[PDB]
Amino acid sequence: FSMFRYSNWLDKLYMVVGTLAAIIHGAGLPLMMLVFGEMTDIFANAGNLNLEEDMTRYAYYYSGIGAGVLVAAYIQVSFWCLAAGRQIHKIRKQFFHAIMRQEIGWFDVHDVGELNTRLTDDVSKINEGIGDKIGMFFQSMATFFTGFIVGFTRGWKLTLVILAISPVLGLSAAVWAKILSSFTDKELLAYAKAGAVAEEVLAAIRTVIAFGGQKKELERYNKNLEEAKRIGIKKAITANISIGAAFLLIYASYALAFWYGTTLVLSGEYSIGQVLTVFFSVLIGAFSVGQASPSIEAFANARGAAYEIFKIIDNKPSIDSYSKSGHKPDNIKGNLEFRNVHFSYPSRKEVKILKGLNLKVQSGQTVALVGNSGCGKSTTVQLMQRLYDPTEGMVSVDGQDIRTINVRFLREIIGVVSQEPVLFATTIAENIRYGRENVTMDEIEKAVKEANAYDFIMKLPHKFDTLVGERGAQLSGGQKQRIAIARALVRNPKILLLDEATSALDTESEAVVQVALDKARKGRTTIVIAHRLSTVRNADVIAGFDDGVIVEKGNHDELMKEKGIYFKLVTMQTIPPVSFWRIMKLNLTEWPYFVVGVFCAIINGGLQPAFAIIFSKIIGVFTRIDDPETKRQNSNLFSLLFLALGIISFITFFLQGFTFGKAGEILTKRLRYMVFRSMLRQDVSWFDDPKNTTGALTTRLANDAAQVKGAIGSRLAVITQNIANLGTGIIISFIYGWQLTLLLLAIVPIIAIAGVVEMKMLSGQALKDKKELEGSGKIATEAIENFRTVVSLTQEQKFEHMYAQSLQVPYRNSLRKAHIFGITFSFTQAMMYFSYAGCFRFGAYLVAHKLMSFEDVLLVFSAVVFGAMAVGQVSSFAPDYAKAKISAAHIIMIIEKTPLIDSYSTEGLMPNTLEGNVTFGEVVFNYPTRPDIPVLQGLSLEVKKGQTLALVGSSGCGKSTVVQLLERFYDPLAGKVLLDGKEIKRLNVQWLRAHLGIVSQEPILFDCSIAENIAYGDNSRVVSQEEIVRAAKEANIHAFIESLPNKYSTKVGDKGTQLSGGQKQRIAIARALVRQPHILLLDEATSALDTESEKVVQEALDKAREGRTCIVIAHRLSTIQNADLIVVFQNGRVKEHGTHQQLLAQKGIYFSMVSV
């Protein structure tokens, strides 16, 4: 995959013209430097002695080359970006077409989300990897070679030494980049412990809040943050040392080159202009190669990904849903013959589900299926639709094999109502019309009437226009089934397969659905897989599938007389803003560091005007007319000075780095600490919201250093360095004349913006496109995750056309952005050449009257222009400021958060002793996530000291909500709750959490030692190993722990992978019992555990029941039998209360549950 461009045979003209334009543009700059050297030489010759004519001629040369540069740059960038846009459009369209056309098995194998992220990331990477980067690389190569050519043709010795020095700097920069990358990877690795701890704690937020173990997790995260801080400080020091060494090497090379050139010219060789042009061209060539480092790498970054994408296009599917070569029968009579159907799913090919079966079905035969859970009746259903292919068998209709007919046409005549129908997020009318494009409003009404969906469909607003919510959120359990049935019927299917037709909420609509389905069956063959036998009785025939083969056959009476498995089954069943002054939170911790950093930044910035002054003096050495030998010595004084400056730079930068990094890491630590603390000292409701997801929160806490540290330190560093450099240059220039200084000030801004934009053109080329790509994202994703239904009804054509339109809508935007980027880049490039021309023409005109010496004019020009270029480059170098500012605003918002239930708060009551007598009255509460769904209906409970209460009812009554409110996770909307006649709100939060104990319905265990895991139940006190052993004996886990290796030292794995689920539940129960809470709550303690284990847990609870109020929420009525009191929930309202014997005497809802 070295040449992965294949589209728009006429687009290659764009690529070729762009390549030529890039070559000529890169070659131009060395020509500009050559004419600059010639102009300097002629100016020096004039100074030694009509200069106006020569100055005008060279100004015209500058103007012509600048116009050529503008045209070439526009052609290059515009054409290359045009080609990139066209290629990316074609690639995305083809890739989506291939994905939709792919076979079902291939999708079932690979993760669908993986495929979606592959699509988006790979296409974005390819977009970044061609067009702009290719043009930049060709420009860099052309500049390299042309500069070397200019140096050689106008130099024989100085060019050689410059070229030989160049690889030293190149290798130094390469090794610096390599070490920086490796150490950045190491630093990333250094956050593994912190990331894991944060993820585990956030996932266990509920349990940790219940146990009040914030301090230990915070300390662990603090240790991890300290390690990461050391790593980051080392990283920053290394990077700053590398940059300083690069600058030192550059200045050493410049000093050596200028010294050698001065010696050579003093020997009588080529004059100063030749030295200047040769040196500048050599440096341009030697440093242009570095500009190519991203492009090629980006190409590689865009290379491998492309490979993978192409593979997906390459694979021709076994079942081409888009192919039309398949035969198309004219009249399709209802008749099915599946003989020796043997097959298995390639996802797990080891297990063979289909082992050959015989099934002959006539027209309009409601052949029901009977078997066991997982017997493979849904495999027979799937194989019926021709999605897969039998390993060895024959499925035919009307004597013709399934493969003998076109897949699309064959699937069109066959409708399937899956167990979990999915409706696309379109209009209900569009949902119905998905069956066939040629569907009229009258047909839609007829289908609605047949499905008996007229009431539900028309009652809501927009009867034929309502947009179905994501995954039918607005729809109902039976509404989706009715809509699917109507859509299936809209296609006039010949074979209708059904699976779990109305197994969603009840059978009220099931009767209507069955009546509608059975209304028309003469021509439309039917197959049904219904768990309920109600419709089985009316079934024309019933086939019993077992061991991958049909066993039972015949009518219901025949099956009953045959003593089949079906007979036994029937018998049994019957945008906050930001602020800088406010964001100055590092001053307290960096009062003496920021000052040194600013001082070093000022010195580094002033280094540039020092270079300008030194270079101007060096040129003036020969610009002078005295021409003594002393100049040689003077030249040395200048030449050596160069080296000195470099050394100073190498110091300051290093001294800067250790400062800046030290300023950063500290904050990076503190924030990472503080934010995490602020995360724990918050209410659960804050964690209960779409915004706060564990992944989002942990990423925000993880990728925050680079933003806050950037915006704080780097902003000040770059601002100080830039003000130093540019202001010093401006003042020094104004000292040496002002008119030329005024013109150069006028032309500085274009230079600065050009530098900034060109620097940004490498990395941040593609950052705003996604905001439009999402317009198709959903459309693609909706067709990937929910692809089974789409392939079922053959609706890929509409999805691909919609994808085409959604790509077209931003395609014009992409074209326009390409054009504007090209135009602005070309104008930016031409700006420098125009500035050179105008400024030097003005300087020549001024010096003609002896107003200012040529040396002064050159000094001002160099100072101001080089300062503009330096500010552009350095401003581009620093991290982006907007993203950093918004991230810092988010961090400030998080850290400043004030909760409704603050654990850290010391305001509250801390009673010495309590009887644990709970009294809740008129308890009203709603979940802040969905306040429009109240769960509490004014409960009334009064549990006395040493009293056991149990909660029963139907799922969804909020049983777990009672426990949640007991721990004071959520404040009550209304009602009074008192533990021994004391207001809950007035009571302390930490004391309440410690004194009480709970057992999670879904217990989780951290990746800690068994002893440590058990001890984590309690906090703020050292638990002796003897206490842990006694508690384990309480839960009957001491012997189990001893049996396993390491005893309690056995490091429990993540979620206790090694340990059994029942073992994890027992460990959680033991941890809860360690604190010996007065009030203990177990929500489905049994749940999934050994019956003997549940009995042992109940016995252990009873042993400590005395003086320990207990609450139990479990489905095992046997445990509730001995419960002191039982309360049955009725939609959040308690119906009956009292002892179990009283409940038995007072028959009611519980009576049915006990019998059930």
Ligand SMILES: CC[C@]1(O)C[C@@H]2CN(CCc3c([nH]c4ccccc34)[C@@](C(=O)OC)(c3cc4c(cc3OC)N(C)[C@H]3[C@@](O)(C(=O)OC)[C@H](OC(C)=O)[C@]5(CC)C=CCN6CC[C@]43[C@@H]65)C2)C1
């Ligand atoms: C004329 C073109 C060029 O000279 C090319 C680079 C950038 N500038 C000139 C000055 C310069 C360079 N580096 C600077 C750092 C701070 C301030 C200025 C510079 C330049 C260099 O060292 O002079 C020879 C350079 C730059 C980079 C550079 C190497 C380099 O020296 C050749 N790296 C290749 C990239 C880089 O992003 C990368 O991915 O390395 C693979 C790299 O990151 C790493 C991993 O170190 C790095 C640090 C050197 C990171 C942040 C900024 N990016 C920009 C590109 C990259 C650099 C050379 C213009």
Ligand SMILES: CC[C@]1(O)C[C@@H]2CN(CCc3c([nH]c4ccccc34)[C@@](C(=O)OC)(c3cc4c(cc3OC)N(C)[C@H]3[C@@](O)(C(=O)OC)[C@H](OC(C)=O)[C@]5(CC)C=CCN6CC[C@]43[C@@H]65)C2)C1
């Ligand atoms: C249209 C915007 C712009 O292209 C921006 C820069 C300036 N001009 C274009 C011409 C240009 C650039 N460089 C030239 C060298 C010789 C002749 C012409 C140029 C430009 C570039 O490299 O594009 C390929 C550039 C120039 C520099 C430049 C960056 C730059 O863009 C890559 N640097 C800011 C300085 C520089 O001296 C410096 O950073 O250290 C002091 C820098 O040295 C380094 C470290 O690369 C360098 C270029 C190698 C060296 C010697 C002379 N100084 C003066 C300014 C500085 C340059 C690009 C206009």
Ligand SMILES: Nc1ncnc2c1ncn2[C@@H]1O[C@H](COP(=O)(O)OP(=O)(O)OP(=O)(O)O)[C@@H](O)[C@H]1O
């Ligand atoms: N598309 C599929 N990909 C992979 N495995 C599948 C697929 N469909 C079914 N299976 C698995 O193959 C076996 C066959 O069971 P299948 O799902 O076909 O039964 P069923 O008739 O739907 O019964 P039930 O719904 O009562 O479990 C099961 O283990 C099932 O999980």
Ligand SMILES: Nc1ncnc2c1ncn2[C@@H]1O[C@H](COP(=O)(O)OP(=O)(O)OP(=O)(O)O)[C@@H](O)[C@H]1O
């Ligand atoms: N964090 C939450 N976000 C959204 N809804 C929630 C949240 N916590 C609870 N709910 C809602 O509260 C109810 C959950 O009931 P709860 O589990 O408290 O009682 P239950 O009778 O023990 O439950 P189940 O019958 O499901 O075992 C559901 O309505 C659920 O939507």
Ligand SMILES: [Mg+2]
């Ligand atoms: Mg099934």
Ligand SMILES: [Mg+2]
């Ligand atoms: Mg529950």
